[PDB]
Amino acid sequence: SSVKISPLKDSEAFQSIKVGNNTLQTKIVYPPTTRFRALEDHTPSDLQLQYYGDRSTFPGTLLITEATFVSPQASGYEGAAPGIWTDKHAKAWKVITDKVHANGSFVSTQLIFLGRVADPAVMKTRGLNPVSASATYESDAAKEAAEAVGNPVRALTTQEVKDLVYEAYTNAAQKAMDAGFDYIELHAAHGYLLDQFLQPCTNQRTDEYGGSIENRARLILELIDHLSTIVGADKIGIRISPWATFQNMKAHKDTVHPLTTFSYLVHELQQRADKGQGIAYISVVEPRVSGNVDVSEEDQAGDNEFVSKIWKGVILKAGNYSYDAPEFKTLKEDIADKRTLVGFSRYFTSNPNLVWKLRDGIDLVPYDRNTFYSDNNYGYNTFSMDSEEVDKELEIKRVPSAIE
Amino acid sequence: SSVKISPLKDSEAFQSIKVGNNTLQTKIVYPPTTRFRALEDHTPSDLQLQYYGDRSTFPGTLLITEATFVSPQASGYEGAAPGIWTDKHAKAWKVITDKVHANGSFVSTQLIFLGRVADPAVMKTRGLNPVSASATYESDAAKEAAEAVGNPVRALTTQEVKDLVYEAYTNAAQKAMDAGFDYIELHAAHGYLLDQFLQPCTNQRTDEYGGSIENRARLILELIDHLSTIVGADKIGIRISPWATFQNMKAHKDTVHPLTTFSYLVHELQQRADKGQGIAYISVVEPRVSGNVDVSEEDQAGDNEFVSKIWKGVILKAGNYSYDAPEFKTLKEDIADKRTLVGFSRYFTSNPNLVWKLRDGIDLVPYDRNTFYSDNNYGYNTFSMDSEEVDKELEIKRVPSAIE
Numbered sequence: 001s002s003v004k005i006s007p008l009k010d011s012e013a014f015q016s017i018k019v020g021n022n023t024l025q026t027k028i029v030y031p032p033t034t035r036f037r038a039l040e041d042h043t044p045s046d047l048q049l050q051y052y053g054d055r056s057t058f059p060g061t062l063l064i065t066e067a068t069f070v071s072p073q074a075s076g077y078e079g080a081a082p083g084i085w086t087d088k089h090a091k092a093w094k095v096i097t098d099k100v101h102a103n104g105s106f107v108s109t110q111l112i113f114l115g116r117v118a119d120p121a122v123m124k125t126r127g128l129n130p131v132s133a134s135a136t137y138e139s140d141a142a143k144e145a146a147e148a149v150g151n152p153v154r155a156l157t158t159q160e161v162k163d164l165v166y167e168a169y170t171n172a173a174q175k176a177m178d179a180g181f182d183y184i185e186l187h188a189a190h191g192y193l194l195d196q197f198l199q200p201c202t203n204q205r206t207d208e209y210g211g212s213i214e215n216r217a218r219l220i221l222e223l224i225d226h227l228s229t230i231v232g233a234d235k236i237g238i239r240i241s242p243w244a245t246f247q248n249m250k251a252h253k254d255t256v257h258p259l260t261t262f263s264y265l266v267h268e269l270q271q272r273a274d275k276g277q278g279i280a281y282i283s284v285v286e287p288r289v290s291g292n293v294d295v296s297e298e299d300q301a302g303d304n305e306f307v308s309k310i311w312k313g314v315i316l317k318a319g320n321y322s323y324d325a326p327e328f329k330t331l332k333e334d335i336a337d338k339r340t341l342v343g344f345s346r347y348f349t350s351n352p353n354l355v356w357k358l359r360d361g362i363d364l365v366p367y368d369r370n371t372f373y374s375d376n377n378y379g380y381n382t383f384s385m386d387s388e389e390v391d392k393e394l395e396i397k398r399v400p401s402a403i404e
Numbered sequence: 405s406s407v408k409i410s411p412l413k414d415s416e417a418f419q420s421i422k423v424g425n426n427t428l429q430t431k432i433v434y435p436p437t438t439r440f441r442a443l444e445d446h447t448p449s450d451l452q453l454q455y456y457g458d459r460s461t462f463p464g465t466l467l468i469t470e471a472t473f474v475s476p477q478a479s480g481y482e483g484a485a486p487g488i489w490t491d492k493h494a495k496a497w498k499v500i501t502d503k504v505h506a507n508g509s510f511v512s513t514q515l516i517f518l519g520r521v522a523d524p525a526v527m528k529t530r531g532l533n534p535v536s537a538s539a540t541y542e543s544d545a546a547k548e549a550a551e552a553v554g555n556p557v558r559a560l561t562t563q564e565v566k567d568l569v570y571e572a573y574t575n576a577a578q579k580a581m582d583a584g585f586d587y588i589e590l591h592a593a594h595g596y597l598l599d600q601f602l603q604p605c606t607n608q609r610t611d612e613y614g615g616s617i618e619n620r621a622r623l624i625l626e627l628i629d630h631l632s633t634i635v636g637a638d639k640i641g642i643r644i645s646p647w648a649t650f651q652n653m654k655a656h657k658d659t660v661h662p663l664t665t666f667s668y669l670v671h672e673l674q675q676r677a678d679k680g681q682g683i684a685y686i687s688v689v690e691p692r693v694s695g696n697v698d699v700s701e702e703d704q705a706g707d708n709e710f711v712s713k714i715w716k717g718v719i720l721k722a723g724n725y726s727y728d729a730p731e732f733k734t735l736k737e738d739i740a741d742k743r744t745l746v747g748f749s750r751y752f753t754s755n756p757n758l759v760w761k762l763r764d765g766i767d768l769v770p771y772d773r774n775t776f777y778s779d780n781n782y783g784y785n786t787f788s789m790d791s792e793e794v795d796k797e798l799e800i801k802r803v804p805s806a807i808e
């Protein structure tokens with residue numbers, strides 16, 4: 001049902017904050033949210049142009065795009081997710097970032113690489129294997145699926161790992177700049193490739209990229225360092241989900257605990273900040289949520305206070321922040337330090353004007369999980385229309401098309 | 405001035421708790437507290453026998469002895485601290501543990517090794533150098549002092565590190581058992597030898613005992629493992645002070661943050677517990693105190709929640725727990741999980757019956773920092789006497805003597 005909320009107008013959520021080179025006028029952020037309304041060849045679509053535009057209308061909002069593939073080897077969904085590796089991709093994204101910018105808002109692109117969870121049939125069509133830090137699967141079913149089509153997961157070679165830094169992510173970053181993104185965000189969360197490198201359940205390498213906490217972090221820090229030299233540290237973010245068990249990450253049951261893995265990473269990031277190479281923000285998933293699933297208090301094994309104690313810069317937190325609506329006690333506590341942003345993903349899907357609703361205490365429209373991942377405009381841009389105007393059957397038939 | 409306190413009788417502080425093989429009847433503990441009333445040759449004294457006996461009278465209290473040297477190379481104070489490496493040491497300690505036991509209470513011995521902070525003149529009299537993980541000093545003054553007597557700090561060789569495990573600590577553990585101690589506690593806090601191994605500001609080794617988080621922890625875990633095979637894991641504790649800057653530990657300013665170093669260690673301890681080799685307790689210093697110094701809230705850089713999230717066994721916490729007297733809100737919160745002990749060091753010096761006073765809400769007698777470290781009975785056992793009975797000049801003259 002609809003969520004009654006108290007207005008946040010007079011709260012820290014509407015105090016300006018500098019994030020890298022840009023100043024936000026609200027601390028409410030749209031986090032990366034996969035929806036599968038890109039074109040078949042991963043170019044952003046007409047639907048996406050309106051979708052991001054509709055969420056940019058409170059001037060000075062930060063929007064972070066849905067996970068966007070860095071390269072063909074980075075892909076692996078059956079649904080149509082966007083990419084940022086070709087000039088065509090960048091030119092289409094630029095229409096979208098232009099629209100957000102014309103509203104005085106800002107946009108970060110989340111760069112994803114699927115890794116061991118890439119669909120093996122999809123990858124086979126590209127003549128590629130699913131790849132990872134090590135040759136592992138998230139489940140027996142995943143292993144059987146891959147072996148059945150003769151396309152097993154394999155470990156990247158040392159040279160391939162270098163190629164991620166100097167080729168795949170470098171080109172994605174260059175394309176992101178061509179596309180006018182204000183930031184690029186490394187996806188190091190939720191059991192995808194970079195999280196697979198960081199944690200021991202997924203990384204048993206014996207080269208410089210595994211075999212210790214420091215070695216497992218090496219690829220991620222190499223990307224931070226190299227990409228900082230290309231786009232500047234002020235245009236870089238990173239997302240982590242220390243507590244998540246999404247895609248079979250062991251988290252607090254792994255042989256190295258997330259507090260160890262992620263405190264190591266965050267302290268290395270702060271040391272870079274101390275030397276003048278501080279990245280724009282660290283985005284962290286609160287333990288209330290794991291990937292796209294809520295986690296009971298009983299099941300929660302830690303929290304993200306360590307990030308606040310170790311990192312001195314901007315932090316973005318997300319995960320069921322309306323759980324204590326209408327008064328938003330937890331949100332208010334979490335933004336009290338004046339360097340913290342708060343994200344809403346699921347409610348932003350059904351409330352394109354969410355910043356305005358939270359500002360003025362307007363009831364939140366419930367979201368529709370059934371249309372989170374479908375291929376058409378129904379449950380996508382229809383939340384911007386008066387219900388009386390929406391032709392459902394027409395909109396279900398409205399698949400993504402080229403911009404303009 | 406005296407501290408008004410509310411009674412803790414009906415609180416979790418007077419619920420029984422199993423710690424290793426023994427059951428305590430109070431959760432109030434006397435933590436290790438150096439006082440320098442041992443004999444010159446480090447044998448425990450008549451004064452110490454009464455001192456520990458006087459603190460054992462609430463049946464089922466755990467007392468932890470003052471830091472006790474594991475070996476001659478472990479020493480380095482000018483004052484007279486006790487040892488546990490000879491039969492003479494063990495026989496004297498056994499008179500003390502017998503007395504505690506006859507009151508139904510229990511006693512752990514804290515095993516210390518000074519390392520880089522050992523007084524270089526004292527060590528020179530033994531024909532030894534101050535030794536450490538690496539050849540470092542806590543200050544320029546310490547370096548100048550050592551070089552001036554031609555006795556610089558030096559790094560232990562790999563073989564010497566093995567000798568700590570198989571000789572120094574093994575023999576101390578065997579003597580501790582001969583002495584009737586219920587537990588041995590590894591001192592891995594406050595900038596002494598084991599803390600010097602754990603943290604990077606003090607350990608730059610290039611053998612298996614330094615050069616990574618795992619390598620720096622290796623000696624400590626080797627001691628836990630080897631000593632568990634000698635005395636049993638149920639007779640082992642360890643003390644850590646993640647946040648302390650005592651003896652120039654860099655703590656949150658080091659190149660690896662304490663949350664990383666100490667979460668690694670504690671999770672490795674829990675993995676041993678999961679396999680049936682769980683140690684009796686982890687003792688942690690709360691960030692209110694660093695060594696023997698209080699730390700302002702402003703200066704506090706983290707907390708010990710991580711220990712509670714990672715370790716499932718008994719935890720002992722200490723550090724200015726009367727700061728929110730009379731109601732003891734923080735103490736009550738911290739023992740609510742039913743597996744946590746709370747220690748008082750400074751107030752136990754001036755209140756030998758502290759468990760009884762806390763039980764029944766009797767005002768605490770102020771402690772006397774001026775006599776914490778002096779060489780005689782004044783301000784030592786005199787707190788057990790009616791003031792009217794105490795002859796001050798006689799007691800100042802009363803230096804430690806042999807038991808019996």
Ligand SMILES: Cc1cc2nc3c(=O)[nH]c(=O)nc-3n(C[C@H](O)[C@H](O)[C@H](O)COP(=O)(O)O)c2cc1C
Nearest residue numbers: 031032033034066067289292319320344345346372
């Ligand atoms: C439909 C959906 C798609 C998502 N896609 C992404 C994604 O592309 N990248 C990512 O880091 N997290 C993704 N997430 C996780 C969200 O960004 C967010 O952290 C999570 O939903 C919790 O926030 P919320 O309670 O406000 O929804 C997704 C979540 C959902 C429900």
Ligand SMILES: Cc1cc2nc3c(=O)[nH]c(=O)nc-3n(C[C@H](O)[C@H](O)[C@H](O)COP(=O)(O)O)c2cc1C
Nearest residue numbers: 435436437438470471693696723724748749750776
């Ligand atoms: C005089 C004195 C001697 C101490 N000696 C030791 C010691 O031998 N080993 C140790 O681990 N801590 C030692 N400490 C630290 C205490 O065990 C304790 O953690 C600290 O005093 C904070 O607790 P409190 O506020 O109840 O005094 C000592 C502290 C003082 C004041």
Ligand code: NA
Nearest residue numbers: 014015016025
């Ligand atoms: Na403003």
Ligand code: NA
Nearest residue numbers: 117118119142
């Ligand atoms: Na999948």
Ligand code: NA
Nearest residue numbers: 117138246247
């Ligand atoms: Na899945």
Ligand code: NA
Nearest residue numbers: 334335337340
């Ligand atoms: Na915060």
Ligand code: NA
Nearest residue numbers: 418419420429
């Ligand atoms: Na009892």
Ligand code: NA
Nearest residue numbers: 521522523546
């Ligand atoms: Na000293």
Ligand code: NA
Nearest residue numbers: 521542650651
């Ligand atoms: Na000192």
Ligand code: NA
Nearest residue numbers: 738739741744
């Ligand atoms: Na507790």
